[PDB]
């Protein structure tokens, strides 16, 4: 796993990880990129090689919503200070997030499934009764 | 979370002479302000010099070792001296139901 | 049972458990594979060691979210600090969580159920009243 | 990547960029120019030579938003300060934005995928039959 | 591009742009202006020369909503001084704007798309195979 | 935003005489009021003249220069003087979330 390095995110958040933090952000990031693999549908065998900016973008940004506001808050406020969030989505990725890591999967998404009568079909009832009446060709 | 605080306790005998020692490590969160502002700090006016006044909460997990008439150090240096006994230290009359927290007027001198 | 360990979710946590906490997380953590292991409808006989990183993720989830509040709590506030949380699902994982763990699922999740109209049926009335009369081939 | 340069995001911003603040902007001007790419569908392979002024302005526009508010905030107040933002959108770009991107798209962008029946097909089965009764011309 | 010039700006502003406010306030002059032109669909050559009152106007009021204030601002105070915008248009513009934008568009703007049935045709297969039997007329 | 502030270390020794020096540049914004109200401007009273007394709040970043018992002169040129340790200077007691701001309670006397 781990489609996303650590020095972009800490670039990205601005500060330097270390110690139980950089840790903890990478069980964060690998928890977000095994969620991004799942839903795309996709296995990416070489992690940090392809790895398509979509993906990177999406798994940053939802290690900074991880890592940042880990338990869903709307409003947090300590003495005069306050702040209010929006409204966290139900996973990791927002709904606008999750169409793009649906891209990759094949076609418009509308895959079907092939059911069946509980039977298991015979198709040779019928030809096997002929004798066979001339050269042998 | 939550911040170790060092805790003195001592009681002063008839000579005068207080006998402060440490009691332990105590876990409390500090309060500089009753709601949305914080409290002005004090001149001293009439003493000699300059220094200031302050009057904050703490909180702490119910059942510390923490008591009124001690003195509380934080981890950058300054230390603090709580007295009164703590308030809000019962159940729900109601129900019975268990907060768990005790809010400690403390005093900041330093 | 016990889908994911106590060390990675130490180190998500950021904390070290010890007493009865250690005890209570790993009751938690118990609880929540279980959980995961019902709604999935797999079994998973050698618990860390198959274990892919969705439902690792999603245990882990579920359990930081127990242990951060047992009681489901909107808004807590003692004096000047204050916080409110968002809404609280009505398991221990979100619907998207859920929908997750349903991947393991055999075929869309559509079973179906064998309907019959109280008869057992013998299909034999009429066949064995034939009497051989050949050379018994 | 990286439709815009960085010199007119600063004279949009009004300020300049150093340390690893520069760095931070770079980044999210290249997930911004990423995700326009994406979603108009185009892949731009000069990107600052041809890169027509709509992406410029989305892409800047996202990249303002993304610096002035990293995690979708409602209200924020510092003691007598106050300030309320207005509903954060679902993805980096506003519907508006997201329809300006999506005109480089072919036609309307009602797009189609092609179904089968599952079958191959032979054009073939009752023409090679014929034997040549001619010239062979 | 640069439908509008910058003294009309700064006159109906009442305030005169200086040092890095003349290039912010340029730059979203142009990306107004090139909005505007995106929506109408001209293409307007010479731009400070023909330039419609009406698409002026449209740039002008953008430029003063964009300047006025750049993250959306729905209600902000320092203090004892209040104000409370209306609801911000969703990408630049209002309604009405973009309706009178859209003036320029050809007929009503109910334009078409040519589908197909993934046909090529030939209409020729009947008409050569005539042979010439007259004169040659 | 923010506007750059002058602040001036000194620790006054048992002479009594104050050795104040330029500390650096900060970067902070000035509060003059707790709400939607401004903080009446004190009378010297007894002071022989005419003078003015306020007690405003300083907002800076956090892990700044500015410690207190320092002085702090503005782009103007009135020179304020700031007392008393930082107030609100912890993180989150339930999560840890930290803010980044302290408020000052810096007193204005220019």
Known sequence: ?137 | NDETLTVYRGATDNKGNPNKQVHGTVKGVFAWGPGTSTNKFGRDRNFKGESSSLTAELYVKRGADLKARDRIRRANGEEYSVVGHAAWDQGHPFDGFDFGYMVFQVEAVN
Chains 1, 3, 4, 5 share one sequence.
């Open chain 1, 1 to 137: 796993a781990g489609l996303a390095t650590i020095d972009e995110l800490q670039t990205l958040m601005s500060t330097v990880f270390e110690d139980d933090a950089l840790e903890q952000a990478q069980l964060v990031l690998d928890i977000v990129s095994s969620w991004a693999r799942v839903v795309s549908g996709q296995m990416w065998p070489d992690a940090p090689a392809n790895v398509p900016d979509d993906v990177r973008a999406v798994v940053l940004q939802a290690s900074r919503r991880e890592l940042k506001n880990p338990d869903r808050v709307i409003s947090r406020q300590m003495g005069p200070f306050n702040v209010q969030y929006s409204q966290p989505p139900d996973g990791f990725f927002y709904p606008a997030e999750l169409a793009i890591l649906k891209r990759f999967k094949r076609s418009g998404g509308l895959m079907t499934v092939s059911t069946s009568r509980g039977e298991e079909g015979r198709p040779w009832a019928g030809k096997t009764a002929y004798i066979r009446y001339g050269d042998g060709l």
